[PDB]
Write an enzyme that holds these catalytic residues in place. Sequence first.
Site, PDB file in Angstrom:
ATOM      1  N   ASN A  62      18.291  11.768  10.706  1.00 20.70           N
ATOM      2  CA  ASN A  62      17.448  12.954  10.581  1.00 20.70           C
ATOM      3  C   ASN A  62      17.162  13.082   9.088  1.00 20.70           C
ATOM      4  OD1 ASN A  62      16.566  15.688  10.117  1.00 20.70           O
ATOM      5  ND2 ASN A  62      17.332  16.168  12.176  1.00 20.70           N
ATOM      6  N   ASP A 104      -0.043  -7.501   2.063  1.00 14.22           N
ATOM      7  CA  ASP A 104       0.484  -6.139   1.978  1.00 14.22           C
ATOM      8  C   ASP A 104       2.006  -6.170   2.047  1.00 14.22           C
ATOM      9  OD1 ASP A 104       0.662  -3.398   1.876  1.00 14.22           O
ATOM     10  OD2 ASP A 104       0.074  -3.086   3.975  1.00 14.22           O
ATOM     11  N   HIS A 148       0.821  -1.205   0.000  1.00 15.13           N
ATOM     12  CA  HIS A 148       0.000   0.000   0.000  1.00 15.13           C
ATOM     13  C   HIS A 148       0.859   1.261   0.000  1.00 15.13           C
ATOM     14  CE1 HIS A 148       0.326   0.266   4.527  1.00 15.13           C
ATOM     15  NE2 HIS A 148       0.156   1.553   4.282  1.00 15.13           N
ATOM     16  N   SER A 202       4.327   2.993   8.027  1.00 17.00           N
ATOM     17  CA  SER A 202       3.979   1.926   7.094  1.00 17.00           C
ATOM     18  C   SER A 202       5.140   1.461   6.223  1.00 17.00           C
ATOM     19  CB  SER A 202       2.809   2.362   6.205  1.00 17.00           C
ATOM     20  OG  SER A 202       1.640   2.552   6.988  1.00 17.00           O
ATOM     21  N   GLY A 203       5.206   0.151   6.006  1.00 18.27           N
ATOM     22  CA  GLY A 203       6.260  -0.428   5.194  1.00 18.27           C
ATOM     23  C   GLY A 203       7.531  -0.693   5.977  1.00 18.27           C
ATOM     24  N   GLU A 232      20.039   6.941   6.765  1.00 22.40           N
ATOM     25  CA  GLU A 232      19.346   8.108   7.321  1.00 22.40           C
ATOM     26  C   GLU A 232      19.047   8.075   8.819  1.00 22.40           C
ATOM     27  OE1 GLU A 232      18.875  10.744   6.017  1.00 22.40           O
ATOM     28  OE2 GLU A 232      17.735  10.871   4.156  1.00 22.40           O
ATOM     29  N   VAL A 236      18.178  16.685   7.347  1.00 23.13           N
ATOM     30  CA  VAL A 236      19.526  17.236   7.454  1.00 23.13           C
ATOM     31  C   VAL A 236      20.536  16.276   6.854  1.00 23.13           C
ATOM     32  CG1 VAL A 236      21.362  17.940   9.036  1.00 23.13           C
ATOM     33  CG2 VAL A 236      18.982  18.504   9.539  1.00 23.13           C
ATOM     34  N   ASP A 283       2.473   2.319  19.927  1.00 23.87           N
ATOM     35  CA  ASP A 283       2.061   1.717  18.664  1.00 23.87           C
ATOM     36  C   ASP A 283       2.784   2.387  17.496  1.00 23.87           C
ATOM     37  OD1 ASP A 283      -1.262   1.298  17.102  1.00 23.87           O
ATOM     38  OD2 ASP A 283       0.635   0.253  16.782  1.00 23.87           O
ATOM     39  N   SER A 284       2.715   1.768  16.322  1.00 19.40           N
ATOM     40  CA  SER A 284       3.303   2.371  15.136  1.00 19.40           C
ATOM     41  C   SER A 284       2.156   3.245  14.635  1.00 19.40           C
ATOM     42  CB  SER A 284       3.700   1.305  14.102  1.00 19.40           C
ATOM     43  OG  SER A 284       2.613   0.467  13.756  1.00 19.40           O
ATOM     44  N   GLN A 298       0.719   6.296  11.239  1.00 23.57           N
ATOM     45  CA  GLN A 298       0.850   6.727   9.852  1.00 23.57           C
ATOM     46  C   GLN A 298       2.246   7.281   9.580  1.00 23.57           C
ATOM     47  OE1 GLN A 298      -2.895   9.251   9.423  1.00 23.57           O
ATOM     48  NE2 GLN A 298      -3.274   7.674   7.862  1.00 23.57           N
ATOM     49  N   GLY A 299       2.851   6.825   8.487  1.00 17.97           N
ATOM     50  CA  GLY A 299       4.185   7.269   8.141  1.00 17.97           C
ATOM     51  C   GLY A 299       5.199   6.181   8.447  1.00 17.97           C
ATOM     52  N   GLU A 314      24.294   9.165   4.259  1.00 19.01           N
ATOM     53  CA  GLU A 314      23.176   8.818   3.400  1.00 19.01           C
ATOM     54  C   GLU A 314      23.578   8.313   2.019  1.00 19.01           C
ATOM     55  OE1 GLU A 314      23.857  11.780   4.689  1.00 19.01           O
ATOM     56  OE2 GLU A 314      22.125  12.704   5.631  1.00 19.01           O
TER      57      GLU A 314
HETATM   58 CA   LIG Z   1      19.810  12.861   6.655  1.00 20.29          CA
END
Ligand SMILES: [Ca+2]
Length: 223
Positions: free
Chosen positions: A54, A84, A40, A177-178, A52, A57, A171-172, A174-175, A62
Amino acid sequence: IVGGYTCGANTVPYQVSLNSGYHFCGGSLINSQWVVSAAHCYKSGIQVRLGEDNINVVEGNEQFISASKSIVHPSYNSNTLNNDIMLIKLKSAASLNSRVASISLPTSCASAGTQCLISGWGNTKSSGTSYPDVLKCLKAPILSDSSCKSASSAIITSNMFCAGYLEGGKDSCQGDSGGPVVCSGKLQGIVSWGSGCAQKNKPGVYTKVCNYVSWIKQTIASN
Ligand SMILES: [Ca+2]
């Protein structure tokens, strides 16, 4: 992540951020060229961000790599979120180091009572909105299926498992996900869905990765 803690820069080396102009989902690096995430979370033109902490920044570790191919599970059902899970191949191999490492796939399924680590850059509020810039972590146990089924108004299949707390607060969200759910050094779940976030009687629902190992291995070997 609601009720979690700041992980620490690069302490979850397999965690990735899926970016399409902004962070929209998490994922897990399973080898130098492949990432596992939630179906999804599919979107055209995905860029995978590794190393990653932050996400706003440039810190120095990265690696930004575009996807060359995306593969949503053949049986993904958008109405129930059954199956899913999605695979993403990177255009070029990631450079593996102490801050960028892959996570192992399960050899067997995990059982209730087992403690797992969930991570992500998702909303940190059960009420309202507040998105963190640094990676958040949460330790949570896998719960018996009935724990999620009891107060659920949606179908919970054998391809999903329950994890979290019944008294809410953790809990986990929105955001997230995955993102990964790692238990005993193995990727056992993918952040999938829930009824709100950190609500009483309603823990999170996650994709049961152990059911997809064959498909994952066959697909990677053939693409
Ligand atoms: Ca960064």
